[PDB]
């Protein structure tokens, strides 16, 4: 993984040496070139992981997340290059520097061979997201959201540090391959109870688990578009990848331990979805949709069945792409109408036909329309949970209503009806926005043909 870290460390002076008018083009070109070279990680096997050295390895689980991350960064640079056109050159270069550092941090975190390196890199991902949220955010109370995000993450992750150092001192190592070959069963003791809690609560915080999800409806709203995308499409999957790695080490206690937590999602993803039925802020609606999808991911990972794992990773990738596209749509509409109120801008189909088509495609991919990746993942999760127990189909099936009952609702109020009279600054669609949304959407429809590369490590 030293063939990708050094290109980002060379991208850093590439955005610190360009002119004031050529930073965006050079950064976009070189990040797209790195995204093109990112496909060499697909040399995987059905039984072995692709190991490069003692510190970096990549199986069939971290590879789609890596590809999504360094495909999302050029999209981030496109999405955040208009509302920062009034900023200072030094602050613009600092913004690009934070984005490049965040991408480097993510691609170093996703390939961490040993778990302590993953933990320190996982906490190191806090700094640029917090800086972006508390600096380039628009609303007044963004400091509260940044403090809530940082403290939820740290209060989750410090018992994770204590448990990881305890495990390393107890058995001898934290390599994932060695722990795959030196695993030991954990008996049903209260020490193992608190060990499971310390190893899990950080990832339940960053997923987020229902009950501890309160850092999402704030930090997803007042943040800018790039911070919203990096919060919605990567870091939750970072927590999911960490939980997937950790849950190997905590058998067979989880079989009688994960009863509340699973069900803390198995009801929560109902009522949070109901919150999307009564939301006046579109970005909060997208954030709560992300909460519901991550609760489904929590259930799939915690029941630890194979089909659940495949559904979890497929829904992870599909929901990340869909939520990034929806956040870009919300940002474009907010730029056009200067308000985040959903009830304000109405009848946008009569003025913006192509944007209405993109809205329709994004809403259809959000409600798991087959044969998209989201339907594949959610269907695999439903099969696995029905294998777990019968009655839980109800707890999924009613969600099958409510998701549609908000998503098409989000499609209706913003697009269908008589248009607003006093709003007369709706410009035609920018080519930048259309390019960004096509770059969001077309990879999903292309991966719908060949999903076998994003179905997990055990396909």
């Amino acid at each position: 993984m030293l063939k990708y870290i050094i290109p980002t460390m060379m991208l850093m002076p590439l955005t610190w040496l360009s002119k004031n008018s050529m930073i965006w083009i050079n950064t976009t070109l070189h990040s797209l070139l790195i995204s093109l070279t990112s496909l060499l990680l697909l040399n995987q096997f059905g039984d072995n992981s692709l190991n490069f050295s003692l510190t970096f390895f990549s199986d069939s689980l971290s590879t789609p997340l890596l590809i999504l991350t360094m495909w999302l960064l050029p999209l981030m640079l496109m999405a955040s290059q208009h509302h920062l056109s009034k900023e200072n050159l030094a602050r613009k270069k600092l913004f690009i520097s934070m984005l490049i550092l965040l991408q480097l941090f993510l691609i170093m975190t996703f390939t961490a061979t040993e778990l302590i390196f993953f933990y320190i890199m996982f906490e190191a991902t806090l700094v640029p997201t917090l800086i972006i949220i508390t600096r380039w955010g628009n609303q007044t109370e963004r400091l509260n959201a940044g403090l809530y995000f940082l403290f939820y993450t740290l209060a989750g992750s410090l018992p994770l540090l204590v448990a990881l150092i305890y495990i390393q001192n107890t058995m001898g190592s934290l390599n994932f391959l060695i722990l795959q070959y030196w695993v030991q069963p954990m008996p049903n003791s209260w020490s193992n109870t608190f060990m499971w809690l310390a190893c899990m609560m950080a990832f339940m915080v960053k997923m987020p688990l229902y009950g501890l999800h309160l850092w999402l409806p704030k930090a997803h709203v007042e943040a800018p578009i790039a911070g919203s995308m990096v919060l919605a499409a990567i870091l939750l999957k970072l927590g999911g990848y960490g939980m997937m790695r950790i849950t190997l080490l905590l058998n067979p206690i989880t079989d009688f331990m994960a009863y509340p937590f699973i069900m803390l999602s198995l009801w929560g993803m109902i009522m949070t979805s109901s919150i999307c039925l009564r939301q006046t802020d579109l970005k909060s609606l997208i954030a709560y949709s992300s909460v519901s999808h991550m609760a489904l991911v929590i259930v799939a990972i915690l029941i630890q069945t194979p089909w659940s794992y495949m559904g979890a990773t497929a829904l992870m990738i599909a929901h990340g792409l869909t939520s990034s596209m929806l956040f870009c749509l919300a940002n474009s509409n907010y730029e056009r109408v200067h308000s985040r109120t959903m009830i304000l801008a109405r009848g946008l189909q009569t003025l913006l036909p192509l944007m209405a088509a993109w809205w329709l495609l994004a809403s259809l991919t959000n409600l798991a329309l087959p044969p998209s990746i989201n339907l594949i993942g959610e269907l695999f999760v439903v099969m696995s949970t029905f294998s777990w127990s019968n009655i839980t189909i109800i707890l999924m099936g009613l969600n099958m209503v409510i998701t549609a009952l908000y998503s098409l609702y989000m499609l209706i109020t913003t697009q269908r009806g008589k248009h607003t009279h006093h709003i007369n600054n709706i410009l035609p669609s920018f080519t930048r926005e259309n390019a960004l949304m096509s770059l969001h959407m077309l990879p999903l429809l292309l991966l719908s043909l060949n999903p076998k590369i994003i179905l997990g490590p055990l396909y």
């Binding site: 003692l54 510190t55 302590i116």
Partner: protein, 57 residues
């Protein structure tokens, strides 16, 4: 005929011919504890680096 000694004659150290044996243990002391072993051998290089959770150098 006894001579009064001069200054410095009585202040000097003399020798004695004595028939008593030398005591090997004047302090009535037991055996001293065994000293700990020292270090031996060539200073070999470090085995697989510092081993500080990810470091190989």
């Amino acid at each position: 005929g006894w001579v009064r000694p001069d200054l410095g004659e009585l202040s000097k150290v003399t020798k004695v011919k004595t028939d008593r044996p030398l005591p090997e243990n004047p302090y009535h002391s037991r055996a001293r504890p065994e000293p700990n072993p020292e270090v031996e051998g060539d200073l070999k290089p470090a085995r697989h680096g510092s081993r500080l959770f990810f470091w190989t150098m």
